[PDB]
Amino acid sequence: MVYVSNKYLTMSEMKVNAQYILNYLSSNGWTKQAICGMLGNMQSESTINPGLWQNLDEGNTSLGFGLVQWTPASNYINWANSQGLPYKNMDSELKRIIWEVNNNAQWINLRDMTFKEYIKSTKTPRELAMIFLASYERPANPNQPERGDQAEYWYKNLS
């Protein structure tokens, strides 16, 4: 059970999605700290909603889409089609993230941490949230300390 929609999720809805993500990425070698660092970013990006378009502008493929707001959406969407995967889908997006780790895509090492180091890291979810913000997400506004608060909130409240 996951929520997939073009709608901002409530804290209760997010917790359902966040536990799912934690389970899935644990099976693929990520630390709970690394996952929670990423979840803190996903909350700001999309309220951890794989169905969410930037500004809720459904179908605008020039802008952000999905858990981490892949931008332009079309690059992710093109990737899913080439893989035979449905784009609007939790597992498809989690597969994209694994593919990015494996092929050194998206990540730019601005904090002396590679993506492969990141997923194995036991630094705090706050520190990891900030590294992931700077290295992976790189939004127009870099000042989003809330992302570290949120990472810690998920680390405490998920299993």
Side-chain angles (χ1 to χ4, degrees):
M1 166 184 68
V2 293
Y3 292 90
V4 177
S5 60
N6 190 41
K7 198 179 132 47
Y8 296 109
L9 295 190
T10 57
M11 201 71 28
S12 305
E13 290 162 346
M14 286 193 267
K15 184 186 178 175
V16 170
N17 284 8
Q19 186 71 231
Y20 184 97
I21 293 167
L22 210 199
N23 295 162
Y24 189 100
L25 292 171
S26 295
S27 305
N28 288 270
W30 293 46
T31 65
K32 182 167 170 183
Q33 299 93 333
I35 294 167
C36 284
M38 177 168 76
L39 291 167
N41 282 266
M42 291 182 167
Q43 174 168 174
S44 298
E45 294 288 350
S46 65
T47 61
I48 330 188
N49 190 337
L52 193 140
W53 296 83
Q54 180 176 176
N55 302 137
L56 312 184
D57 192 356
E58 184 173 32
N60 184 348
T61 55
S62 79
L63 289 182
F65 173 80
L67 294 168
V68 292
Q69 295 282 292
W70 279 281
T71 312
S74 59
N75 289 159
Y76 164 70
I77 294 167
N78 282 158
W79 174 88
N81 292 332
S82 307
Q83 291 290 295
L85 289 167
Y87 78 90
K88 188 189 301 166
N89 178 288
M90 173 73 82
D91 286 358
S92 299
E93 294 177 28
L94 290 177
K95 288 164 176 207
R96 172 66 186 195
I97 299 173
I98 291 159
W99 179 98
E100 281 163 354
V101 173
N102 276 275
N103 302 111
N104 201 39
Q106 188 60 30
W107 192 273
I108 296 165
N109 188 352
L110 295 179
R111 296 298 178 269
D112 191 26
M113 179 172 292
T114 65
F115 210 165
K116 276 159 175 326
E117 290 183 313
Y118 177 89
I119 64 160
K120 296 303 157 175
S121 179
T122 49
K123 295 184 188 288
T124 74
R126 190 177 312 278
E127 305 166 67
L128 290 175
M130 302 313 294
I131 293 158
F132 191 92
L133 168 65
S135 315
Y136 186 106
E137 299 278 15
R138 312 192 300 273
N141 178 1
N143 301 122
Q144 318 195 21
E146 94 254 351
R147 286 172 190 234
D149 295 341
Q150 297 160 2
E152 300 287 350
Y153 176 96
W154 297 118
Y155 190 74
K156 197 174 77 87
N157 296 272
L158 305 176
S159 311

